[PDB]
Amino acid sequence: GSVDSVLFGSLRGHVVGLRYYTGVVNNNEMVALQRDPNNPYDKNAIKVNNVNGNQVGHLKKELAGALAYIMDNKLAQIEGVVPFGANNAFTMPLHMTFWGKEENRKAVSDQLKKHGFKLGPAP
Amino acid sequence: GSVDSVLFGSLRGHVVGLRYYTGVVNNNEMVALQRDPNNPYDKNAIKVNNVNGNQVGHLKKELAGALAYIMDNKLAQIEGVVPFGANNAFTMPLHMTFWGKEENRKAVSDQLKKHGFKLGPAP
Ligand code: NA
Ligand code: NA
């Protein structure tokens, strides 16, 4: 939205590890992605928090494995929305919208491609 | 979407009337929805413009009939993206995201349902 920036595309994925956390989400709600570089199992960890800031889970490890570099180097802004399945037991769907500057679009695309991902259309 | 607005959902439709207008859209790009209340063929008309303000076409008449009331009464903000098919000669896919004040949620859904529509998952 921010002027100077454009929608790049979207990805679909899942929040995992719900059984380990107590944070809850409603359908159609935004969630916050938050890097956790101190995670002692995965340096590329990305937590998913609800709008109140309580943790819900993590991005699946393959997806974090691609996105952590994009977050760390501020190559895009990534907004997550849970479209449905907010009451699921183990994993929850997540829709991610990517936006930013064109000077960074190639880098985002290359990072995703090198990890087997590809953006779909926005939002 | 700004606080305290919420996402209501999504709608998929088409931009029509492309053969009549000069405006070009790029694949995977935002468009502007603009009410055309003095359109003599349809008081409910909604123009679709590209990011320069040039008209590209119109929302299909059946969809405009549902959405004009929503726009005129400021019940939701509606954001349009053309996800693909931007090179189509006649009609072009359009993805609409709806957001607004949570107190308008019933009014939006009742208005859409009067015209045989409902929103899908956000965004
Ligand atoms: Na045209
Ligand atoms: Na025109």
Swiss-Prot record, chains A, B:
Coiled-coil stretches: none
Expressing tissues: Expressed in brain, heart, kidney, liver, lung, pancreas, placenta and skeletal muscle.
Highest taxon listed in the record's lineage: Eukaryota
Cross-link (Glycyl lysine isopeptide (Lys-Gly) (interchain with G-Cter in SUMO2)): 60
Compartments where located: Cytoplasm; Nucleus; Nucleus, Nucleolus; Nucleus, Nucleoplasm
Family listed: Belongs to the SNF2/RAD54 helicase family. RAD16 subfamily.
Additional facts recorded: Subject to frequent epigenetic inactivation by promoter methylation in colon cancer.
Known function: Has both helicase and E3 ubiquitin ligase activities. Possesses intrinsic ATP-dependent nucleosome-remodeling activity; This activity may be required for transcriptional activation or repression of specific target promoters. These may include the SERPINE1 and HIV-1 promoters and the SV40 enhancer, to which this protein can bind directly. Plays a role in error-free postreplication repair (PRR) of damaged DNA and maintains genomic stability through acting as a ubiquitin ligase for 'Lys-63'-linked polyubiquitination of chromatin-bound PCNA.
Quaternary structure annotation from Swiss-Prot or TrEMBL: Interacts with SP1 and SP3 independently of DNA; the interaction with these transcriptional factors may be required for basal transcription of target genes. Interacts with EGR1; the interaction requires prior binding to DNA and represses c-Rel via a DNA looping mechanism. Interacts with GATA4. Interacts with PCNA; the interaction promotes polyubiquitination of PCNA through association with the UBE2B-RAD18 and UBE2V2-UBE2N ubiquitin ligase complexes. Interacts with RAD18, SHPRH, UBE2V2 and UBE2N.
Protein name: Helicase-like transcription factor
Organism: Homo sapiens
UniProt lineage: Eukaryota, Metazoa, Chordata, Craniata, Vertebrata
Gene, per the UniProt record: HLTF
Entire-sequence positions represented here: 55 to 175 of 1009
